[PDB]
């Protein structure tokens, strides 16, 4: 192995994280087109962000 101009596969395969089998980018949130809208909608929804086990204000009225 003397040369070093054999390329076979491309490094960096920023592949969905949802699994959806299509190219995603890291610049978003390591989503596609589609599923990044999808996750985003459900993110927003929630307001109070915060991972580390529980979550503050989880009430509701009847
Ligand atoms: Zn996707």
Same mark, same amino acid.
């Given at each position: 192995?003397?040369?070093?101009?054999? /390329?076979?596969?491309?490094?960096?395969? $920023?592949?969905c994280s949802t699994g959806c089998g299509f190219?995603?980018?890291?610049? /978003?949130?390591? $989503?596609?087109s589609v599923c990044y809208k999808e996750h985003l909608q459900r993110q927003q929804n929630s307001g109070r962000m915060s991972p580390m086990g529980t979550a503050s204000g989880s009430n509701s009225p009847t």
């Open positions: 192995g003397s040369m070093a101009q054999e /390329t076979n596969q491309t490094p960096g395969p $920023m592949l190219y995603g980018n890291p610049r /978003t949130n390591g $989503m596609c």
